[PDB]
Design a protein around this ligand. Sequence first.
Ligand code: G2P
Ligand code: MN
Ligand code: MN
Ligand code: MN
Lengths: 505, 170
Amino acid sequence: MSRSYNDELQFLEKINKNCWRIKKGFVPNMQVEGVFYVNDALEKLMFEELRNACRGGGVGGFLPAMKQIGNVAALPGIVHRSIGLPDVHSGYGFAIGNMAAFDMNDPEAVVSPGGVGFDINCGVRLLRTNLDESDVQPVKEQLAQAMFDHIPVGVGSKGVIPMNAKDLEEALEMGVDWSLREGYAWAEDKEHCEEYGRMLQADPNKVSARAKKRGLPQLGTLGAGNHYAEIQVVDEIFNEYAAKKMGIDHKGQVCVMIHSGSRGLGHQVATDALVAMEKAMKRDKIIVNDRQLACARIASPEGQDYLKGMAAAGNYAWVNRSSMTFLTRQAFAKVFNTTPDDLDLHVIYDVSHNIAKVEQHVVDGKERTLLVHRKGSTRAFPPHHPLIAVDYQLTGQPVLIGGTMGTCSYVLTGTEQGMTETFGTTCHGAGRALSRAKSRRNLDFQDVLDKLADMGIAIRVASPKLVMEEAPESYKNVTDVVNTCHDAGISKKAIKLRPIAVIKG
Amino acid sequence: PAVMAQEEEDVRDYNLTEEQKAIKAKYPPVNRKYEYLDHTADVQLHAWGDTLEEAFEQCAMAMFGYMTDTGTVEPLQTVEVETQGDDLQSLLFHFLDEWLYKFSADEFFIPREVKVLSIDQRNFKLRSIGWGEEFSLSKHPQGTEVKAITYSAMQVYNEENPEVFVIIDI
Ligand SMILES: Nc1nc2c(ncn2[C@@H]2O[C@H](COP(=O)(O)CP(=O)(O)OP(=O)(O)O)[C@@H](O)[C@H]2O)c(=O)[nH]1
Ligand SMILES: [Mn+2]
Ligand SMILES: [Mn+2]
Ligand SMILES: [Mn+2]
């Protein structure tokens, strides 16, 4: 980070109204170029991060997202581009909102666990109800409290449904199939879940004892950070055909958005693989620009062991989100004295954003088998793709975009242009504009709580005096993110939702 | 008296009860030589001390200080953590990871204080201990869960005023 800002700009070129190019040389050994999609408002945030992430000529600082996109473009076996999506911001290896694809028939192609992330298969599930805003407004606080009472949130929380080591071993192999067998999920849930909620190559023998000891008490918990369970109200329908296939009937309909991942089991699986690869990068002679990008050849034993444990961690995350769904259904049933089935509390879709997937794509006119890394970005497959649930074959695959607890959220669908320009990858959220440390300093917790109250949004959080770290101003404008994706043609807007109650850990 | 902090002080406020406040008044405050610095997605721990050993132990205390108010933790038990690495960075990584694991499994131990007894800089081996008790939601306030240690922008300065910078995943 010893270059001047203006010298860094020598490697940056605007491609079109919504896309920037990162030319080779920005960081060492780039095999392809990097790109990031930003409109005017998102462009300023991205370049400010470049200027300010390592401002001083001394110690400290961190790596801005642009540098991370370039570092990922140096990973062996990458094809096309290292791609930042409109919500992109600095992460810890890949940028948050960073996609990279590797040709599995190139023997030098690698898999990077530290780039997939510690929260393996962290994702968003959207539920619908047959309730209206007018049915919830009278009991908003009671429902917010019922959610908080049913869903364990925050550091130290433990699962309420008892689980033993053997149940965990089955959940790692079966994913949502386990929740179905045990009666915590409905058959319709699996049908509207990405991968049908189970990655078949999952091998519990590749998940370490430590991962299993961390995961057991936490299965069925939300976690902390930006994880949430949010009661929402449909605010705008951009695609009536898409809305119809999703079960969205009218503006004013109540939905629930749940965001959580594979918890301590997944965090440990990623850590174990990260450690195993530092121990192995000598043999295969792999150089990286960032130690956090430690990786292995896809066909190596370390790479295969990671991919199998990653899939098992993926199955755990699907089991965890089903548990949140079951507990959310219990809360609604209690507050409205009606069974969950009588409330039409069905899954619209469940899509993940921290995963590596084997996918068929065309590269320069030739169809290839690629290992697609998506860190903080979502698969968004196009209409008529065979690997989409039947109900969404003609709409395109739903994409669930959380904004903030005090703005809005969106549902999008994948497009053919997206399949072509970004390997069917779109954004996963708004992304951050202010660090938690900077939000702690510049914002007051009571001001955030009052603003939410002046907006009529009920809230239950584990650490109330830290809520400024999740303030709406801490995140990018989600509408800028979704509009950039839409104008770029990689995603199509479908639904807009507004929060009315939120629980956070 | 060297000012190592790069930001103005900013204590995180965990919403203490009267009993939590009373447990903290009962014990000698722990000296804090760490701070929470800017990182867009997560947080950067910055810790320092008079020896590399102290910079390490303050980094672990910084990590635990992000999960709860460690001043409310009583020194009822002592736990040992020994680890090794191939260099100072991986030693620091494994040291923080081993302590994170003590908190996340088995006995769910939260230290009020951590002390590094030795860093063997020829083998990159470390001996440390911590005193505290089992983390309990009835006893300790909820901060933020730490998911993992990362190497992102990790810096270990081993000169006259040792200090470390570590980004952790939250
Ligand atoms: N509808 C909501 N969206 C939110 C809320 N809080 C944060 N976010 C959005 O969710 C988006 C996704 O955030 P991330 O998945 O990157 C945060 P997370 O802790 O899950 O990252 P990991 O460490 O990878 O697990 C984020 O950019 C925000 O725009 C919320 O309260 N409600
Ligand atoms: Mn997550
Ligand atoms: Mn997430
Ligand atoms: Mn994180």
